[PDB]
Design a protein around this ligand. Structure first.
Ligand SMILES: [Zn+2]
Lengths: 47, 50, 453, 295
């Protein structure tokens, strides 16, 4: 996910009129899946 | 025996006008199951999937 | 249609007749009894909702609020109500009272609009006709016979007065609307082509046009007195006046009262005074645009086998003189078997008019017999035979005109064709033989253009 | 040709209307009747063959203002579709004859209701849920007779003026699903009090939860927006868009449910922290509470 999310970041910089209506639809559900993986990155307990 | 019941909420995906907003159930929206041109839908309170 | 399209719809005939009136008469028309009629006769919701908008607003509003009230998906229906806005002739577009193109309604009509909806006063409960506080206390079925007699006399004038000898001037009245035709070799008038359809639906909507027929002269007759008098029978029954109309009347009010009583919408007592009571047929005038009734079993039933169309028989005294007026059928020995050798009798009536849609309407819609019991279409294959009889009268043409022959060039004859076409005197042209038919009405004008070119 | 019907639910609360006049208000209980005087006349102006039905909402019952329940408008109906035994007033409907008699029944019926309000039983508030239970039984009785030829296109108008009481809010939701089968529309006209149950009647059936600001500006939001014709309401757009959203949470619990579970197998939606039963007499296996309690 660290390298996949970087691909559209270097592509939407050439069309600012279209990139506005393309960041307010997928970010709401993507933050939930990323939050579940960010906790286990620093989790040091098996229970 | 059953656990975890989904309690979604009804939204309109707009503020004042429907055509002024990107409507609901479009292309870039995560709801790619039934695409088209609607006016509103539900979303999971634990995942925010419209 | 030959003069009945404006009768089926009431809100369209009122807007067309209002456009050709005097400015002083329209001022008195904008009254409180007329506010409940310009909206009730309508049907679309857009034309009826704008009446409430001009009542609360005290200042003229611009067109910006109208183009925005349709939001975004409603301007298509706005163009349909645009032509109706000029029909009633009550709004007015100013210059810029507070924005751009301010729309305002006539304040004379706005004052009387609140009297019959919100506000009130006193003169509304003092004048007769529009009110007349009086109850009914007379035998109702006894007065229903007089309502049928008023319409039966009109049928005698359409045939030729077989047994009537009344002095009612109803033959010339119906001739102005294209219903009755004067006989050329004789003197009793007959009937036109559009008059046959009136004797089929039997709707009280035609009687509304007869009341406004005398007003079309525009000489010494006002509409404010006719509109306030026509509202009496529009309130169904239990709407009288006892003797209040006797004290408050004049010579003009008595003239319109005698003509309305002979139509079949109101009954008047002896000596043309005392108490008056509206008939039963006036209820269907305010209910819808048409109506049915008059039978409980429908003994009539036609035949859908052969092609001569055996019409129904044995009913009452209404269908006896009705079928003979259509095309004069035949009858045999038993209970008047009508229409049994229809081959030459129908062609006798079609020679004086293209009465093709009235025979089909009488054959299909006579008492609703086949469409209720059977299932397939009522007419078999006669739909093509009826059209053949109408084309037989198109084989010839009796018209006069002059013909111009012997020209010189071909490009010169094309210029002359535009002279008779613009004036409206051209009938048929021929560019291959250089021939043009000109009516004698404009013969003195076509000869002048040829001598100059 | 065509008939219509409008059921107005007036929240006649002597407690709320009795205290509004103290705050220097010009739209009190005496002026609330004028709203029916205008809406009842504008409805008949578009079509003289319509019918009027006004239902009140008192703190003890839902009295029928028009027609009343007394010996005048109870057994015999004064509807315009009954020419016999009713024609001194039901004959000149085209002005102020039958329209005045329609408002006179409301004034005559409210006489017995205003005098029967000794408020000696402390406070009971207005049973607002019982008002809609009487409107469905009235529109179904007339529909069975008018189903032939005619169709009678009607609506449901609700005017909210106060809160609820100790009544079970489940009864207020039974009239919502019972009205969807007949394909009818339910409205809502709040004045000061706000509730989340009345807004549900406008989202399920497709109504409109309108919020009235000041009181004297009431004739504008009940004629164009709350039009019984409901023919151009899809492209009308006059009230502001709905911003807030109130639904339903737990039944017999003091928490906002969003992922919680019921007690066991019944319908009382509670929470997820329940290894055994709660307020019933059932049981529940211990094959899931050991899993949910961990994480
Ligand atoms: Zn339980």
């Amino acid at each position: 996910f660290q390298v996949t999310k970087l691909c559209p970041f270097q592509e939407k910089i050439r069309r600012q009129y279209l990139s506005t209506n393309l960041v307010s639809h997928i970010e709401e559900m993507l933050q939930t899946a990323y939050n579940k993986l960010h906790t286990w990155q620093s989790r040091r307990l098996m229970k | 025996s059953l656990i975890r019941m989904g309690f979604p909420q009804h939204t309109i995906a707009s503020l004042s006008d429907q055509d002024a907003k990107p409507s609901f159930s479009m292309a870039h929206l995560d709801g790619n199951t039934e695409p088209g041109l609607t006016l509103g839908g539900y979303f999971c309170p634990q995942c925010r999937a419209k | 249609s030959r003069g009945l399209n404006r009768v089926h719809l009431q809100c369209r005939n009122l807007q067309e007749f209002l456009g050709g009136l005097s400015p002083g008469v329209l001022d008195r028309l904008y009254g409180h009894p007329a506010t409940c009629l310009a909206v009730f006769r309508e049907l679309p919701s857009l034309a009826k909702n704008w009446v409430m908008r001009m009542l609360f607003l005290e200042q003229p509003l611009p067109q910006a609020a109208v183009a925005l009230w349709v939001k975004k998906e409603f301007s298509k229906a706005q163009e349909e109500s645009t032509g109706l806005l000029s029909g009633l002739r009550i709004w007015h577009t100013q210059l810029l009272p507070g924005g751009l193109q301010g729309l305002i309604l006539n304040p004379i009509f706005r004052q009387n609009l609140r009297i019959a909806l919100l506000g009130g006063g006193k003169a509304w409960s003092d004048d007769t006709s529009q009110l007349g506080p009086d109850k009914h206390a007379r035998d109702v079925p006894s007065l229903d016979k007089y309502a049928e007699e008023r319409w039966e006399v009109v049928l005698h004038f359409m045939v030729g007065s077989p047994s009537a000898a009344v002095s009612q001037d109803l033959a010339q009245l119906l001739s102005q609307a294209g219903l009755m035709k004067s006989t050329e070799p004789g003197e009793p008038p007959c009937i036109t082509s559009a008059g046959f359809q009136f004797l089929l639906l039997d709707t009280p909507a035609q009687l509304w046009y007869f009341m406004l027929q005398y007003l079309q002269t525009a000489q010494s007759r006002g509409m404010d007195l006719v509109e306030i008098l026509s509202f009496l029978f529009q309130l169904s029954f239990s709407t009288l006046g006892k003797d209040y109309s006797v004290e408050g009347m004049s010579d003009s009010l008595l003239n319109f009262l005698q003509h309305l009583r002979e139509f079949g919408l109101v009954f008047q007592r002896k000596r043309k005074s005392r108490r008056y009571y509206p008939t039963r047929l006036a209820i269907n005038l305010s209910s819808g645009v048409s109506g049915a009734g008059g039978t409980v079993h429908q003994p009539g039933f036609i035949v859908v086998e052969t092609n001569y169309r055996l019409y129904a028989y044995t009913e009452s005294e209404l269908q006896i003189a009705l079928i003979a007026l259509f095309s004069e059928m035949l009858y045999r020995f038993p209970n008047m078997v009508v229409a049994q050798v229809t081959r030459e009798s129908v062609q006798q009536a079609i020679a004086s008019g293209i009465t093709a849609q009235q025979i089909i309407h009488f054959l299909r819609t006579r008492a609703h017999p086949v469409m209720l019991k059977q299932t397939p279409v009522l007419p078999p294959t006669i739909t093509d035979q009826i059209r053949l009889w109408e084309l037989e009268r198109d084989r010839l043409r009796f018209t006069e005109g002059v013909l111009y022959n012997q020209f010189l060039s071909q490009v010169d004859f094309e210029l002359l064709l535009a002279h008779a076409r613009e004036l409206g005197v051209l009938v048929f042209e021929n560019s291959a033989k250089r021939l043009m038919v000109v009516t004698p009405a404009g013969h003195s004008d076509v000869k002048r253009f040829w001598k100059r070119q | 040709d065509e008939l219509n019907l409008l059921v107005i639910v007036v929240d006649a609360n002597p407690i709320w209307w009795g205290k509004q006049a103290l705050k220097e208000s010009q739209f009190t209980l005496s002026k609330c009747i004028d709203a029916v005087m205008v809406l009842g006349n504008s409805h008949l102006f578009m079509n003289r063959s319509n019918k009027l039905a006004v239902i009140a909402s008192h703190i003890q019952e839902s009295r029928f203002l028009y027609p009343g329940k007394n010996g005048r408008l109870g057994d015999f109906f004064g509807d315009p579709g009954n020419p016999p035994e009713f024609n001194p007033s039901g004959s000149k409907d085209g002005k102020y004859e039958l329209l005045t008699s329609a408002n006179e029944v409301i004034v005559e019926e409210i006489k017995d209701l205003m005098t029967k309000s000794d408020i000696k039983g402390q406070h009971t508030e207005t049973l607002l849920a019982g008002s809609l239970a009487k409107a469905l039984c009235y529109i179904h009785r007339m529909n069975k007779e008018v189903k032939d030829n005619q169709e009678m296109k009607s609506r449901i108008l609700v005017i909210k003026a106060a809160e609820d009481s100790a009544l079970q809010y489940m009864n207020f939701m039974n009239v919502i699903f019972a009205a969807q089968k007949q394909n009818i529309l339910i409205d809502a006209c709040v004045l000061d009090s706000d509730s989340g149950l009345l807004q549900q009647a406008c989202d399920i059936t497709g109504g409109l939860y309108l919020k009235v600001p000041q009181m004297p500006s009431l004739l504008q939001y009940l004629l164009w927006v709350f039009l019984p014709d409901q023919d151009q309401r899809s492209q009308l757009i006059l009230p502001p868009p709905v911003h807030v959203d109130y639904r339903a949470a737990c039944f017999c619990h003091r928490n906002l449910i969003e992922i919680g579970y019921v007690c066991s197998v019944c319908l009382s939606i509670f929470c997820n922290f329940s290894p055994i039963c709660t307020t019933c007499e059932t049981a529940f296996k211990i094959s899931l509470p050991p899993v949910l309690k961990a994480k």
